[PDB]
Amino acid sequence: NPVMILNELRPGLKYDFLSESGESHAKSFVMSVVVDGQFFEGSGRNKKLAKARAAQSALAAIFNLHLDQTPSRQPIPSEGLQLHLPQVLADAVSRLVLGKFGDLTDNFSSPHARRKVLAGVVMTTGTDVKDAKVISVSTGTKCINGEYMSDRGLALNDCHAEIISRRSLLRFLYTQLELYLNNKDDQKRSIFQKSERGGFRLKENVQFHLYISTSPCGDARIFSPHEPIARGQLRTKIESGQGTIPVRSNERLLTMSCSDKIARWNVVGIQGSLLSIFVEPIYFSSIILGSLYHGDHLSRAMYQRISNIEDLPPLYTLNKPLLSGISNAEARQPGKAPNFSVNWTVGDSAIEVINATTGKDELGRASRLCKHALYCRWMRVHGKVPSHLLRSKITKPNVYHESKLAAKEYQAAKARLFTAFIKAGLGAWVEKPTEQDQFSLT
Amino acid sequence: QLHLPQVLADAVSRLVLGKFGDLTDNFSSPHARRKVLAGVVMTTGTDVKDAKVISVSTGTKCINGEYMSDRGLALNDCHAEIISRRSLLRFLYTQLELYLNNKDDQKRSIFQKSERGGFRLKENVQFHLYISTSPCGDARIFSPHEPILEEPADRHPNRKARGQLRTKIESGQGTIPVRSNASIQTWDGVLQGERLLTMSCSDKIARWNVVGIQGSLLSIFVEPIYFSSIILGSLYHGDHLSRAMYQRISNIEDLPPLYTLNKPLLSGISNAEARQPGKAPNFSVNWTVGDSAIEVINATTGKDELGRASRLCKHALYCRWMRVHGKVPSHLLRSKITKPNVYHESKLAAKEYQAAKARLFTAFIKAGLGAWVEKPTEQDQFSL
RNA sequence: GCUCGCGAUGCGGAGGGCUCUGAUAGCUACG
Numbered sequence: 001n002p003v004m005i006l007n008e009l010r011p012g013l014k015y016d017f018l019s020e021s022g023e024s025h026a027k028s029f030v031m032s033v034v035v036d037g038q039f040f041e042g043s044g045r046n047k048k049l050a051k052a053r054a055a056q057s058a059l060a061a062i063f064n065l066h067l068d069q070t071p072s073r074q075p076i077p078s079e080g081l082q083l084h085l086p087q088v089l090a091d092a093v094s095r096l097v098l099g100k101f102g103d104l105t106d107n108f109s110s111p112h113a114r115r116k117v118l119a120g121v122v123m124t125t126g127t128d129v130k131d132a133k134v135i136s137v138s139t140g141t142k143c144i145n146g147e148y149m150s151d152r153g154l155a156l157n158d159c160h161a162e163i164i165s166r167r168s169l170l171r172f173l174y175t176q177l178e179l180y181l182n183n184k185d186d187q188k189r190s191i192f193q194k195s196e197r198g199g200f201r202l203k204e205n206v207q208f209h210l211y212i213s214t215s216p217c218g219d220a221r222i223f224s225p226h227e228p229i230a231r232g233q234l235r236t237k238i239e240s241g242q243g244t245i246p247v248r249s250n251e252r253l254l255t256m257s258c259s260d261k262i263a264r265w266n267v268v269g270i271q272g273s274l275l276s277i278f279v280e281p282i283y284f285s286s287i288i289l290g291s292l293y294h295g296d297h298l299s300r301a302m303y304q305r306i307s308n309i310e311d312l313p314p315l316y317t318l319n320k321p322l323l324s325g326i327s328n329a330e331a332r333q334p335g336k337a338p339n340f341s342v343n344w345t346v347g348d349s350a351i352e353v354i355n356a357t358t359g360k361d362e363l364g365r366a367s368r369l370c371k372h373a374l375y376c377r378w379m380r381v382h383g384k385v386p387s388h389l390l391r392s393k394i395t396k397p398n399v400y401h402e403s404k405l406a407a408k409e410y411q412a413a414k415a416r417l418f419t420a421f422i423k424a425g426l427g428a429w430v431e432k433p434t435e436q437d438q439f440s441l442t
Numbered sequence: 443q444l445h446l447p448q449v450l451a452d453a454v455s456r457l458v459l460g461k462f463g464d465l466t467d468n469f470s471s472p473h474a475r476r477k478v479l480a481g482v483v484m485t486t487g488t489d490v491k492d493a494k495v496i497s498v499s500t501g502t503k504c505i506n507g508e509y510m511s512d513r514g515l516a517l518n519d520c521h522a523e524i525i526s527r528r529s530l531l532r533f534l535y536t537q538l539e540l541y542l543n544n545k546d547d548q549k550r551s552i553f554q555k556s557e558r559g560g561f562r563l564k565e566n567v568q569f570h571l572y573i574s575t576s577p578c579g580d581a582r583i584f585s586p587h588e589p590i591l592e593e594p595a596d597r598h599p600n601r602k603a604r605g606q607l608r609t610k611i612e613s614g615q616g617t618i619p620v621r622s623n624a625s626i627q628t629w630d631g632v633l634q635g636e637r638l639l640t641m642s643c644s645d646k647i648a649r650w651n652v653v654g655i656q657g658s659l660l661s662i663f664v665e666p667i668y669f670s671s672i673i674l675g676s677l678y679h680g681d682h683l684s685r686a687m688y689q690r691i692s693n694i695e696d697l698p699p700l701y702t703l704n705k706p707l708l709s710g711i712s713n714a715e716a717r718q719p720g721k722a723p724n725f726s727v728n729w730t731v732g733d734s735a736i737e738v739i740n741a742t743t744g745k746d747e748l749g750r751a752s753r754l755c756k757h758a759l760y761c762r763w764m765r766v767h768g769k770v771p772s773h774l775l776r777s778k779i780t781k782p783n784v785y786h787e788s789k790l791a792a793k794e795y796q797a798a799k800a801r802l803f804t805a806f807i808k809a810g811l812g813a814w815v816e817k818p819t820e821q822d823q824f825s826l
Numbered sequence: 827g828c829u830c831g832c833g834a835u836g837c838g839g840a841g842g843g844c845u846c847u848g849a850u851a852g853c854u855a856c857g
């Protein structure tokens with residue numbers, strides 16, 4: 001009992017009413033108090049719970065961190081307890097992504113603030129709390145309906161929020177690249193550097209953390225949250241929808257589940273193939289779950305299930321980031337999922353709104369985040385790049401797939417990841433129709 | 443005592459009611475507080491002496507999707523008639539073990555060896571189902587009110603919507619038809635917030651009228667069992683009930699032998715039950731003959747107030763299935779198909795029941811009545 | 827006999843907010 005333990009420890013300590021959003025199948029409250037001179041916070045869909053979590057927050061931070069059920073504890077990464085406590089890092093990133101979402105959604109009064117899933121990327125450069133900035137923000141829980149896949153890179157295949165956040169992260173990564181390889185006055189203030197091995201690398205101590213308001217679909221969610229206490233298969237998403245099915249073993253096309261995709265990023269990096277031709281691989285340092293966190297299942301699904309992996313290409317590893325949930329977890333909303341996806345990256349004017357079921361925008365235009373637009377920015381970068389900084393002999397490219405193919409080493413990493421999955425008995429990844437990349441900027 | 447069917451109905455009504463009172467110390471315990479009551483009653487002879495209450499249950503709710511057990515430990519559906527059947531299953535297992543103890547005890551079982559394999563019921567034993575009301579979906583949705591003679595019967599028997607399969611839906615009112623033919627559920631979807639679909643009680647009883655009431659696991663031992671009559675405490679509409687129970691799928695064909703489309707007696711009672719004023723309780727009570735006390739389960743969690751699993755969850759039933767499996771002569775089995783000892787797979791071992799269920803789903807689909815909606819599979823992937 | 831669209835009056839499981847009662851338990855204050 002949070003309220004009871006705190007008001008038995010401390011004197012009579014009443015509070016006041018702060019926030020009131022929605023009603024019925026959607027409502028939200030937030031409470032704050034001052035205990036021993038503090039300003040703690042608590043969020044919940046009814047008043048008694050908002051304050052109760054504010055109480056457990058105040059207690060854990062002030063006297064000693066709360067002792068809870070064990071599966072709700074976070075596993076520290078292979079390296080890094082530097083970002084203060086891991087749980088405090090989670091609270092920080094979560095509040096940051098919520099705050100920027102509030103900014104983009106005219107402070108939650110916009111109709112797009114109704115979201116079933118919220119995702120975000122956060123960049124940090126220094127252990128001090130000030131040195132932290134929200135890179136991108138996104139929403140979405142649906143996928144392109146197979147009937148509307150546009151082949152020439154004009155449709156978004158996957159608008160689950162965490163996917164959209166990674167794609168905005170790439171949109172930010174290219175911009176930092178042009179910052180470095182633009183007017184060289186931008187080279188001092190940049191996240192990039194020429195690599196100590198030939199090519200491009202990130203500056204030391206600049207990290208990225210991933211936030212999802214919930215556990216990613218697929219393997220990291222397949223568990224009973226009210227019975228914490230051997231299968232890790234790959235799963236594919238269901239037609240234009242939330243929820244995943246496992247793959248058969250060794251008729252419409254499937255998109256891989258979000259747990260599977262997060263694994264892939266934990267092996268071959270978040271930058272993808274084209275970016276690999278230029279930058280050294282980049283790995284998320286932490287994963288923050290708004291809700292539905294179970295340390296065991298999350299760890300299984302993110303990297304542990306493919307610990308049978310070997311033959312790590314030069315500069316690749318099985319990335320084992322920090323896993324953690326947030327202190328004040330979100331709660332389940334029964335009901336249908338929106339048909340839209342919201343994306344925003346740092347430096348952007350406004351949010352962008354895509355219809356998740358068509359992958360083209362609310363008006364019918366392709367996205368600032370689809371294959372075609374990303375290729376054009378990649379071509380911009382290939383133009384003004386010194387011809388010797390490239391990592392493979394990517395000679396002036398003509399087609400999206402082939403340019404992707406020039407990332408021989410990235411592709412080696414993909415090969416060994418698929419090997420790890422089949423050798424583990426978890427099934428065979430579902431590769432997209434290859435023709436979905438057979439276009440140029442023509 | 444040869445009787446008009448109306449006396450049979452009033453009798454079973456009386457019986458289930460009195461048993462409920464006895465368990466609730468004359469309806470005075472707070473566990474008497476119920477909106478709906480169901481019961482099973484067994485007969486062995488036409489005389490009133492030859493009638494015994496097999497089980498008693500109450501309830502009007504189903505589980506929150508956040509609380510589904512990946513280890514067979516939570517009850518999905520506590521509508522009363524669902525729960526009463528599960529109590530029947532517990533008595534069924536007990537009677538198997540009563541036969542398999544020794545031949546002085548096997549004389550007093552309701553089972554006997556079948557001349558076709560496994561066990562069969564002794565002749566002159568039949569089961570009757572009592573619901574104090576109409577079962578949700580097709581038998582109820584169109585007129586959930588006591589009809590008055592002024593208003594005869596259904597003025598629109600041919601609307602598309604008559605006879606459709608329907609689901610209960612998490613945090614939603616009503617029983618919904620199955621749209622776009624169907625949309626299978628997922629585990630990580632329902633966790634996200636996809637509302638959990640559960641087939642309606644009208645549908646489930648239809649299903650029991652084709653594949654029998656024993657489920658698949660029990661089919662591995664027993665021949666199929668059918669309710670001989672269905673008795674309604676209130677809200678009885680003969681045309682809708684008969685449509686809902688069997689007639690909507692009287693197109694069913696090529697069923698395994700000893701499977702059939704069962705058309706039980708349908709009847710309401712002389713003095714209908716009356717509405718229970720109050721909030722609907724969120725809890726369900728269960729009892730089988732031979733039980734010490736009632737069990738009280740929170741329907742929205744499907745576990746008991748302390749958090750314990752039910753003597754009725756998938757897991758407890760699997761355990762009773764294994765106990766009987768041990769004592770069964772490996773040649774007395776009705777299916778010799780072997781399966782690893784996990785709940786889902788074991789059920790697959792019931793090839794003939796599965797065939798029947800396939801014919802049931804096909805009958806509904808070819809009738810335009812929709813496609814059955816199953817739960818996410820991850821809830822049957824458990825062992826002991 | 828029905829289907830579909832738009833209305834209209836109703837019928838029939840979630841969330842929230844405020845009051846009433848009893849009880850359990852932790853705390854004070856007073857005589």
Ligand SMILES: O=P(O)(O)O[C@H]1[C@H](OP(=O)(O)O)[C@@H](OP(=O)(O)O)[C@H](OP(=O)(O)O)[C@@H](OP(=O)(O)O)[C@H]1OP(=O)(O)O
Pocket residue numbers: 157158163166167255256261271272273274370371404430431432
């Ligand atoms: O964010 P996503 O939608 O998951 O995008 C990825 C990405 O495609 P794009 O880069 O064109 O957006 C992958 O390419 P890389 O990032 O590795 O360069 C691609 O995999 P391949 O290019 O290796 O084919 C994969 O598609 P799939 O894994 O199904 O082939 C595809 O995800 P979707 O196809 O699910 O959109």
Ligand SMILES: O=P(O)(O)O[C@H]1[C@H](OP(=O)(O)O)[C@@H](OP(=O)(O)O)[C@H](OP(=O)(O)O)[C@@H](OP(=O)(O)O)[C@H]1OP(=O)(O)O
Pocket residue numbers: 518519524525527528640641646656657658659755756789799815816817
């Ligand atoms: O109607 P209920 O009392 O809820 O239980 C039934 C029963 O499941 P269990 O008896 O295994 O608990 C059916 O299984 P059988 O008796 O036929 O073996 C099962 O159907 P399947 O096992 O054929 O999948 C059905 O589940 P479903 O409705 O998904 O087909 C399930 O009912 P609920 O899922 O509604 O709880």
Ligand SMILES: [Mg+2]
Pocket residue numbers: 816817
């Ligand atoms: Mg099923």
Ligand SMILES: [Zn+2]
Pocket residue numbers: 160161216217257258259
């Ligand atoms: Zn997803």
Ligand SMILES: [Zn+2]
Pocket residue numbers: 521577578642643644
């Ligand atoms: Zn029902």
